[PDB]
Amino acid sequence: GSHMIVGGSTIQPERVDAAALRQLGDAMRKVVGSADPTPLADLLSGTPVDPDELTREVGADGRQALLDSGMAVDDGTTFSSPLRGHQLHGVVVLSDPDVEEEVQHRWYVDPLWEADLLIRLMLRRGGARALDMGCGSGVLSLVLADRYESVLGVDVNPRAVALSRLNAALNGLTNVTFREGDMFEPAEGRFSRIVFNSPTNEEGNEFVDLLEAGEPILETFFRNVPRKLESGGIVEVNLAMNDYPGDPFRERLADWLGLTENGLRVQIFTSQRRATESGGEWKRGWLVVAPGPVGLTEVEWPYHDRYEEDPDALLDGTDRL
Numbered sequence: 001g002s003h004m005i006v007g008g009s010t011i012q013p014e015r016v017d018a019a020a021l022r023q024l025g026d027a028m029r030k031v032v033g034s035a036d037p038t039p040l041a042d043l044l045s046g047t048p049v050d051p052d053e054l055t056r057e058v059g060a061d062g063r064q065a066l067l068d069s070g071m072a073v074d075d076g077t078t079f080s081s082p083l084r085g086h087q088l089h090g091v092v093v094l095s096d097p098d099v100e101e102e103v104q105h106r107w108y109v110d111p112l113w114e115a116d117l118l119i120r121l122m123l124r125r126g127g128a129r130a131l132d133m134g135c136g137s138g139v140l141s142l143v144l145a146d147r148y149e150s151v152l153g154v155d156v157n158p159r160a161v162a163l164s165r166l167n168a169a170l171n172g173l174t175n176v177t178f179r180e181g182d183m184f185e186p187a188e189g190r191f192s193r194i195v196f197n198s199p200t201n202e203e204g205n206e207f208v209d210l211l212e213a214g215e216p217i218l219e220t221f222f223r224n225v226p227r228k229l230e231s232g233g234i235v236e237v238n239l240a241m242n243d244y245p246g247d248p249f250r251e252r253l254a255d256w257l258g259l260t261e262n263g264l265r266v267q268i269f270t271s272q273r274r275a276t277e278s279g280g281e282w283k284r285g286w287l288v289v290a291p292g293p294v295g296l297t298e299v300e301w302p303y304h305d306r307y308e309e310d311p312d313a314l315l316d317g318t319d320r321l
């Protein structure tokens with residue numbers, strides 16, 4: 001048909017018993033991320049697999065649970081999966097494979113481009129109630145679930161809600177809730193923790209799709225953050241920022257947050273930057289709202305480079321700062 005097919009597959013965990021899902025999840029903990037792929041690990045890496053082999057490893061029920069949830073598809077001979085398995089930070093996560101923009105369905109889910117990294121940037125603290133805006137595959141929500149009494153994930157992509165729910169089910173996590181909706185609209189009450197791996201990269205002000213929504217989505221997030229955040233609470237945001245001549249991002253951010261009016265402390269840790277036509281600058285960085293002296297600070301923290309060199313060096317970094 002048309003070429004934008006990756007990310008349109010039907011995902012339906014509610015079609016399977018939660019016990020079957022937690023068993024499949026247990027099979028996945030054994031083999032996903034381990035070299036010399038078993039049948040199940042190779043299925044979750046995108047290779048066609050004989051169901052005979054797959055059956056010996058997860059059972060006949062496990063084999064049906066893969067088909068009924070949509071984790072696998074029966075060609076005729078073999079089984080294939082439209083998703084990819086990951087195992088990190090104590091959790092097992094499925095998501096779409098990493099592929100080029102041009103073959104991305106409008107419901108394509110973040111293939112975990114920065115999730116492992118952002119999880120290492122996250123303050124290791126815990127508390128009452130966490131929110132994960134744009135939760136995608138649910139990966140950030142599943143991690144936070146370990147140190148928060150409850151976690152709410154929100155995404156406007158109904159495929160990502162289904163996938164998030166599947167992944168929670170695979171890990172047998174019971175304190176995680178996902179809702180479909182537009183930004184804060186289904187997030188009732190306040191939160192002691194808010195995390196946002198934002199849909200922003202090189203699109204500037206332009207809305208391109210659900211993964212690159214333009215600066216307007218950041219303005220909405222940050223304008224509404226003060227009424228969503230508990231006193232003493234913590235916001236963390238992965239984002240792309242654009243500085244234009246006489247028009248720096250950090251100032252637009254201050255207005256959105258009502259920085260002085262709300263008494264907020266905001267630090268931006270900038271990791272990558274490149275000059276643009278307009279004479280201004282593109283940045284990628286990590287923004288944290290946390291308690292302390294009212295104001296906005298910006299530092300250079302090349303955490304993308306230090307990640308390539310030694311990932312565990314990033315643990316408790318924002319705490320040290």
Ligand SMILES: NC[C@H]1O[C@H](O[C@H]2[C@H](O)[C@@H](O[C@H]3O[C@H](CO)[C@@H](O)[C@H](N)[C@H]3O)[C@H](N)C[C@@H]2N)[C@H](N)[C@@H](O)[C@@H]1O
Pocket residue numbers: 098099100101110113114197198199200201202210211212238
């Ligand atoms: N190497 C090939 C890949 O290159 C691009 O991948 C980008 C990611 O997009 C970007 O992720 C960030 O930008 C997304 C929007 O682009 C946001 O939604 C997301 N929250 C945010 O973390 C990473 N930082 C860097 C990576 N090079 C393409 N997009 C992708 O199709 C392609 O396979």
Ligand SMILES: Nc1ncnc2c1ncn2[C@@H]1O[C@H](CSCC[C@H](N)C(=O)O)[C@@H](O)[C@H]1O
Pocket residue numbers: 109110111112113114115133134135136137138139140154155156157160181182183184197198199210211213217
């Ligand atoms: N208006 C909106 N309301 C809620 N989520 C939105 C949104 N617009 C885009 N998003 C979501 O924001 C997510 C950004 S990608 C990050 C996904 C996941 N948290 C991870 O780290 O891997 C996407 O899933 C996208 O669907």
